[PDB]
Amino acid sequence: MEFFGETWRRELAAEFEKPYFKQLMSFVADERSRHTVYPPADQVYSWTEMCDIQDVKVVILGQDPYHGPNQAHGLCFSVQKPVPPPPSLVNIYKELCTDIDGFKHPGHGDLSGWAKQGVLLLNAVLTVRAHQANSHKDRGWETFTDAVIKWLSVNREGVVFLLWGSYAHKKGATIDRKRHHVLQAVHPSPLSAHRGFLGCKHFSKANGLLKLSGTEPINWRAL
Amino acid sequence: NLSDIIEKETGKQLVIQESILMLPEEVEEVIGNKPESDILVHTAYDESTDENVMLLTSDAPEYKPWALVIQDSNGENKIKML
């Protein structure tokens, strides 16, 4: 299926045939017929394409896609080169500077270099109408991403979930705490970041957790 | 709509870069008041003043303005209930 990496399709295939997903697709088609929707159709499932499903080592959850021109490209927090890092990403990058020695602001906000190493950058909602935050909520995506998160909780082991802000804590509340590692913090948004996101050291702690499986760490620096 | 709301309040014509949903409890201590329901934290950067400028609204589809926060480099806030 178009735009969806095959190791992902194989495993999630039941979902696509389900009424709710089919009704999601034609909601999205309708939206595109009449408005601009972000990200572009061919980048909605970018996260399925940067790595294989077996190779996922870390999960970072997001909400919905940036709603400005050229920002979203189907990975949570990341922006298409050369868009400036949004305010939350600025704070993510601030945390990396003090958490990961040698980390250097890469001079862009494209996080694909993480995704290619097994960092699943998953928004819970996958599309948005231009200029309208949260405008595609409860149209089916929540249900589908719940399906993706379940599948990873059930079928993989030792995956580190980094959950930022309460909505993301919520979305990860059923992750099997025996088979996986969940780390929680408040959102990197400027409203909250100096209130627990800065100093959370999630990126090194993740690599500390990976090392217990004899799993090779994420090189957070390769952006 | 929303950047006009920012302009009226602060005289700055700015571009919202992101909108983050937060629980009432998530926003309460920072703001010193609890909103009736979820809030979207809509954030622009004012490059002139090196300030993060946040317009908190209710969720889509209403986006009713709740509060405006102006944050400096070290994260100190100036808060105005709307």
Numbering used by the authors:
A (entry chain A): 82 to 304
B (entry chain B): 3 to 84
Sentences from the paper on this structure:
The crystal structure of the cUNG–Ugi complex was determined to 1.9 Å resolution with eight cUNG–Ugi complexes in the asymmetric unit, all related by non­crystallographic symmetry. However, the crystal structure of the cUNG–Ugi complex reveals that the conformation of cUNG is almost identical to the uncomplexed cUNG structure. The interface analysis also shows that the average hydrogen-bond distances are slightly shorter in the cUNG–Ugi structure (2.8 Å compared with 2.9 Å in hUNG) even though most hydrogen bonds are formed between the same residues as in hUNG–Ugi. There also seems to be more alternative hydrogen bonds and side chain-to-main chain hydrogen bonds in cUNG–Ugi, as well as two electrostatic interactions in the cUNG–Ugi interface (Lys218–Asp40 and His250–Glu28) which are not found in hUNG–Ugi. For example, both the DNA backbone phosphate-mimicking Ugi residues (Glu20 in the inserted β-sheet and Glu28 in the following α-helix) are bound tightly in cUNG–Ugi.
Uracil-DNA N-glycosylase (UNG) is a DNA-repair enzyme which initiates the removal of uracil in the base-excision repair (BER) pathway by cleaving the N-glycosidic bond between the uracil and the deoxyribose backbone. Uracil-DNA N-glycosylase from Atlantic cod (cUNG) shows cold-adapted features such as high catalytic efficiency, a low temperature optimum for activity and reduced thermal stability compared with its mesophilic homologue human UNG (hUNG). Ugi is a small (9.5 kDa), acidic (pI 4.2) and heat-resistant protein encoded by the Bacillus subtillis bacteriophages (PBS1 and PBS2), which use uracil instead of thymine as a normal component of their DNA. It blocks access to the active site of UNG by inserting its β1 strand into the conserved DNA-binding groove of the enzyme without contacting the uracil-specificity pocket.
